[PDB]
């Protein structure tokens, strides 16, 4: 029973990664903590993908606590792909040593998604049900071994001089203002919960009747179904680009609306500053549509605004105003 603070590093608000150590002697890795997946992998010495030679590669041979599982790992995100071999070893996440933890050793990471990525591997934080066969999610090994004070992990996020933070076993109230509002997780796979509606001046632009959304730190934007996100891009002032995309006039924030996510009777506004990422002169929408549709993904755009707490104990998501 212990608590752990993982400083998260922020690259261009699109990737949040912290440091972790694998095996004995400990080998160091940066890993994006992803609440939208349940597999923990790191590059390994068996991987000869460019993404692998330009990132840190775990060497199981150098680790004595390493235990080969033998079972393949292959994961498809919405953005990226990795194939791996499964094994066991000791992961030190901060001050929590997570013994005999199933970790994927990447074999091939085709594509360029991880290649130009800041971090080496991903550490899924979703439910076990999302985890690959043979694979046990990291927080899950922590709970079963009772290494966390409470079966809760909390995320805070963003920028400069700077300090994003993942906390394990606890919640840091200094990262949020107001009170934490607990949203029940409906479907335990993703950190999925119901969003009552999406309003723009009390008007529902999207998410009519209610819709399902997942709190996903590994998603940079705020993804919603095509039609709905369209109606949002037009309801705000965005335009479609000239080499594909949606743009926002940076000088126009003051005149643009607040996009309020209602979750459990409580309002989660996203100001034009939150839903707008600026590249010095050029502002784009933090709203991304899904080629298809259905589930809304509340990414680092929402997470940056709302200190999120993932409670495995009670299958709650606590939401509060980020500091």
């Amino acid at each position: 029973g212990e608590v752990a603070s993982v400083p998260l590093t922020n690259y261009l608000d699109s990737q949040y990664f912290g440091k972790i150590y694998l095996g004995t002697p400990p080998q160091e890795f940066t890993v994006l903590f992803d609440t939208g997946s349940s597999d923990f992998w790191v590059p390994s010495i068996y991987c000869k993908s460019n993404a692998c030679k330009n990132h840190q590669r775990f060497d199981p041979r150098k680790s004595s606590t390493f235990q080969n599982l033998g079972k393949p790992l292959s994961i498809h995100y919405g953005t990226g792909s990795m194939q791996g071999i499964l094994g066991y070893d000791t992961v030190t996440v901060s001050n929590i040593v997570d013994i005999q933890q199933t970790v994927g050793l990447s074999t091939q990471e085709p594509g360029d998604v991880f290649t130009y990525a800041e971090f080496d591997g991903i550490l899924g934080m979703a439910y076990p049900s999302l985890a690959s066969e043979y694979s046990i999610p990291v927080f899950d090994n922590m709970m079963n071994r009772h290494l966390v004070a409470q079966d809760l992990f909390s995320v805070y996020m963003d920028r400069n001089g700077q300090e994003s933070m993942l906390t394990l076993g606890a919640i840091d109230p200094s990262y949020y203002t107001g009170s934490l509002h607990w949203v029940p997780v409906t479907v335990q796979q993703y950190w999925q919960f119901t969003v009552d509606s999406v309003t723009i001046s009390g008007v529902v632009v999207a998410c009519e009747g209610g819709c399902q959304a997942i709190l996903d730190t590994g998603t940079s934007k705020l993804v919603g179904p095509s039609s709905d996100i369209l109606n949002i891009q037009q309801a705000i002032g965005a335009t479609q680009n000239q080499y594909g995309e949606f743009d926002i006039d940076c000088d126009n924030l003051s005149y643009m609306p607040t996009v309020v996510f209602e979750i459990n009777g409580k309002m989660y506004p996203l100001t034009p500053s939150a839903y707008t990422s600026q590249d010095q002169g050029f502002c784009t929408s933090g709203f991304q549509s899904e080629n298809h549709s259905q589930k809304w993904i509340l990414g680092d755009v929402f997470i940056r605004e709302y200190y999120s707490v993932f409670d495995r104990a009670n299958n709650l998501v606590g939401l509060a105003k980020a500091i």
Partner: peptide
Amino acid sequence: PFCX
């Protein structure tokens, strides 16, 4: 944007 990345979609973990």
